[PDB]
Design a protein around this motif. Sequence first.
Motif, PDB file in Angstrom:
ATOM      1  N   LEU B 115      -0.743  -1.673  -0.934  1.00  0.00           N
ATOM      2  CA  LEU B 115      -1.670  -0.553  -0.816  1.00  0.00           C
ATOM      3  C   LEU B 115      -2.679  -0.771   0.304  1.00  0.00           C
ATOM      4  O   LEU B 115      -2.836   0.072   1.192  1.00  0.00           O
ATOM      5  CB  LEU B 115      -2.412  -0.344  -2.141  1.00  0.00           C
ATOM      6  CG  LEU B 115      -2.410   1.064  -2.748  1.00  0.00           C
ATOM      7  CD1 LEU B 115      -3.295   1.078  -3.991  1.00  0.00           C
ATOM      8  CD2 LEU B 115      -2.916   2.075  -1.739  1.00  0.00           C
ATOM      9  N   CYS B 116      -3.353  -1.914   0.275  1.00  0.00           N
ATOM     10  CA  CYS B 116      -4.359  -2.210   1.278  1.00  0.00           C
ATOM     11  C   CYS B 116      -3.821  -2.229   2.704  1.00  0.00           C
ATOM     12  O   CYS B 116      -4.580  -2.021   3.656  1.00  0.00           O
ATOM     13  CB  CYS B 116      -5.069  -3.525   0.933  1.00  0.00           C
ATOM     14  SG  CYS B 116      -6.131  -3.380  -0.547  1.00  0.00           S
ATOM     15  N   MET B 117      -2.520  -2.466   2.859  1.00  0.00           N
ATOM     16  CA  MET B 117      -1.921  -2.478   4.187  1.00  0.00           C
ATOM     17  C   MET B 117      -1.510  -1.079   4.650  1.00  0.00           C
ATOM     18  O   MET B 117      -1.198  -0.883   5.822  1.00  0.00           O
ATOM     19  CB  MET B 117      -0.711  -3.423   4.234  1.00  0.00           C
ATOM     20  CG  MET B 117      -1.060  -4.889   4.524  1.00  0.00           C
ATOM     21  SD  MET B 117      -1.734  -5.198   6.194  1.00  0.00           S
ATOM     22  CE  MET B 117      -0.346  -4.786   7.187  1.00  0.00           C
ATOM     23  N   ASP B 118      -1.506  -0.106   3.743  1.00  0.00           N
ATOM     24  CA  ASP B 118      -1.152   1.255   4.127  1.00  0.00           C
ATOM     25  C   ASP B 118      -2.461   2.000   4.331  1.00  0.00           C
ATOM     26  O   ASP B 118      -3.203   2.229   3.380  1.00  0.00           O
ATOM     27  CB  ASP B 118      -0.325   1.947   3.039  1.00  0.00           C
ATOM     28  CG  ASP B 118       0.235   3.289   3.497  1.00  0.00           C
ATOM     29  OD1 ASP B 118      -0.563   4.174   3.880  1.00  0.00           O
ATOM     30  OD2 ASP B 118       1.476   3.461   3.472  1.00  0.00           O
ATOM     31  N   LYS B 119      -2.743   2.362   5.576  1.00  0.00           N
ATOM     32  CA  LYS B 119      -3.980   3.058   5.919  1.00  0.00           C
ATOM     33  C   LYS B 119      -4.111   4.421   5.250  1.00  0.00           C
ATOM     34  O   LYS B 119      -5.215   4.883   4.977  1.00  0.00           O
ATOM     35  CB  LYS B 119      -4.077   3.233   7.433  1.00  0.00           C
ATOM     36  CG  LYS B 119      -4.067   1.922   8.206  1.00  0.00           C
ATOM     37  CD  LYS B 119      -4.184   2.177   9.698  1.00  0.00           C
ATOM     38  CE  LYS B 119      -4.057   0.881  10.472  1.00  0.00           C
ATOM     39  NZ  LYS B 119      -2.743   0.230  10.214  1.00  0.00           N
ATOM     40  N   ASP B 120      -2.986   5.069   5.005  1.00  0.00           N
ATOM     41  CA  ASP B 120      -3.002   6.376   4.375  1.00  0.00           C
ATOM     42  C   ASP B 120      -3.225   6.293   2.864  1.00  0.00           C
ATOM     43  O   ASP B 120      -4.197   6.839   2.336  1.00  0.00           O
ATOM     44  CB  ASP B 120      -1.692   7.101   4.661  1.00  0.00           C
ATOM     45  CG  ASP B 120      -1.582   8.410   3.912  1.00  0.00           C
ATOM     46  OD1 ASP B 120      -2.508   9.242   4.016  1.00  0.00           O
ATOM     47  OD2 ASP B 120      -0.571   8.598   3.220  1.00  0.00           O
ATOM     48  N   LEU B 121      -2.332   5.597   2.174  1.00  0.00           N
ATOM     49  CA  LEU B 121      -2.434   5.475   0.725  1.00  0.00           C
ATOM     50  C   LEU B 121      -3.735   4.843   0.260  1.00  0.00           C
ATOM     51  O   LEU B 121      -4.325   5.289  -0.723  1.00  0.00           O
ATOM     52  CB  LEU B 121      -1.237   4.692   0.172  1.00  0.00           C
ATOM     53  CG  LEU B 121       0.000   5.474  -0.298  1.00  0.00           C
ATOM     54  CD1 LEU B 121       0.001   6.906   0.230  1.00  0.00           C
ATOM     55  CD2 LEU B 121       1.245   4.716   0.132  1.00  0.00           C
ATOM     56  N   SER B 122      -4.195   3.811   0.957  1.00  0.00           N
ATOM     57  CA  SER B 122      -5.439   3.157   0.559  1.00  0.00           C
ATOM     58  C   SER B 122      -6.620   4.131   0.626  1.00  0.00           C
ATOM     59  O   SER B 122      -7.457   4.174  -0.274  1.00  0.00           O
ATOM     60  CB  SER B 122      -5.712   1.951   1.454  1.00  0.00           C
ATOM     61  OG  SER B 122      -5.863   2.346   2.804  1.00  0.00           O
ATOM     62  N   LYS B 123      -6.682   4.904   1.701  1.00  0.00           N
ATOM     63  CA  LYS B 123      -7.757   5.877   1.872  1.00  0.00           C
ATOM     64  C   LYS B 123      -7.715   6.974   0.807  1.00  0.00           C
ATOM     65  O   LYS B 123      -8.762   7.441   0.345  1.00  0.00           O
ATOM     66  CB  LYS B 123      -7.688   6.487   3.273  1.00  0.00           C
ATOM     67  CG  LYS B 123      -8.140   5.515   4.368  1.00  0.00           C
ATOM     68  CD  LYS B 123      -8.343   6.218   5.705  1.00  0.00           C
ATOM     69  CE  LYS B 123      -8.924   5.258   6.745  1.00  0.00           C
ATOM     70  NZ  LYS B 123      -8.004   4.118   6.992  1.00  0.00           N
TER      71      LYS B 123
END
Lengths: 322, 322
Positions: B115-123
């Motif tokens: 999650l933290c590595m996905d800029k979209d999903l994390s946001k």
Amino acid sequence: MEFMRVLLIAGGVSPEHEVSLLSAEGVLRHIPFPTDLAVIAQDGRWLLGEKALTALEAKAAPEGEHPFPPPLSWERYDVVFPLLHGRFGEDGTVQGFLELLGKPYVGAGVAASALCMDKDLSKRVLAQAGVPVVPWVAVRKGEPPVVPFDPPFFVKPANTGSSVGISRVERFQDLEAALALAFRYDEKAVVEKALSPVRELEVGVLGNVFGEASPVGEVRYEAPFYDYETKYTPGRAELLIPAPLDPGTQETVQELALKAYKVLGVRGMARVDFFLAEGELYLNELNTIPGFTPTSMYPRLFEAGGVAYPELLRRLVELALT
Amino acid sequence: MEFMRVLLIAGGVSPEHEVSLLSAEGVLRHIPFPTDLAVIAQDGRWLLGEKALTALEAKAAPEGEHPFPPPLSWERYDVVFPLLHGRFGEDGTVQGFLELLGKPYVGAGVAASALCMDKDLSKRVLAQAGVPVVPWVAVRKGEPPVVPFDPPFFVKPANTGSSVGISRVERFQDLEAALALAFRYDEKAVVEKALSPVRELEVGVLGNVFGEASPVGEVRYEAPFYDYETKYTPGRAELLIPAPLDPGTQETVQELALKAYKVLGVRGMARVDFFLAEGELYLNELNTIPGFTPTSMYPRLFEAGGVAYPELLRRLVELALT
């Protein structure tokens, strides 16, 4: 050109191990390419070659000969179909392993798999995107629960499946015990508002990120009863395809499923389950590796959608490579 | 009792490979327990035992002797510290592998890492939880971009690091090319509104889910210049600890970091980076495996927070086991 080679992995350590193994026989018979089989025994150890096939002779395989990183060639396959359910199957762990192996595989990637298996995180993303889900709240061990709704609700560990550790709380006096139970399976639990009457609908999706939907199906429970001729008849789950849905509701279920699928970036497939209550729809959960047996909903939905079992299997492999 | 044994894995295939290797020397010297080292060469192959240590004699290790699933005992270690950055390091892949091995490891689990590595999903998750983030929109290959804001913005692949494939678009006429570039690294990209002036603040967190925060630090750029005595002096990144923050802003940065950490269920550690503009704070990104060198921000922040380097390393190992 040479035949394409596929490796089917079935079984798994989750309680759905038997469902997985049951699928293998069907996948091996119908996958349109030469396919090898590897089984993950309930104890975590793998069964390869001859022992793997023999394992298909039983409803379960508690065996296991090889400690995790199995002595499998991997290089002999173009694609891997990890037909494993729940924990250590749909949670991104196996996907992560395969990624490190540089092997293309069927279904959702690591991020999507882990997300879809977390009841809390998945709902947060879906709610953020405007997709309706049943009111819920996450509760972590040590943390004081602050349920913003009525007492009739479900309590369950956030990242598990098969309904393990789940409780239907009738009164707050029971909430305490319920969380303690759930926390035995995951330090994070979710409390969801229980709906009633409510109907359960399921839709399949096929494709990478932008998919196509299958017709909608309904899961209906048939109570046990005393038949005039056969006497006692056990309760049974009835899969209605197509679901008897009013004009427009089918279209809304399909749109929500495809929208959620695109937002989460799911690849290959997913069976999206919904709740229908008071004319209101709620995305229940997305299953990245749905049951694949003949009685299973996902394959039957696409069959009704004009996609043959072998065709479905072929497309799943092709998507893995694109 | 016997000494506890730790396995440090460093290097990695991501462009931050050299930063990782640089950390190893420091971790090996200060970790309060006997620690073995394994290195992942830039080509993906592993270096064990003697070759691994020799690899620490250079800034990088393009070598690699063993194909992925390395012939490592695993059973000889109580905890694994995968000090790898970005792709195949902080994205849940290695974490997934270790989970299948049944080995406790330092840092975030599979879900949180991916999650933290996905800029979209994390946001999406953070915005859902009420945490401020810079306005953004996700764009997938083949999809028409619909940026809801001004032309000055960043375009970047959603799941990568080290600023690879990133572009700062000045005019929509360039948007097209920018996405095409990003898509070369990830089929999903994100377009973020570029802020200016803006300051960069970073805070460390330590613990499992409910953590403690370190003091806040600021990253300031020092332009190259001609010195009166030494003449030419190269540009440099200046890490200010503590950050010169007004009364109250420090406290808000720390609260947002800990809140985001708890929501995402991060374990062990994380360096949370923020943007400060117009008195407004924005969570930039969470790094589950921050740089661990002597010059590195995360360890220096906790040092200022009263936690010695060896103490920090010891706590990370203890958290892995709880």
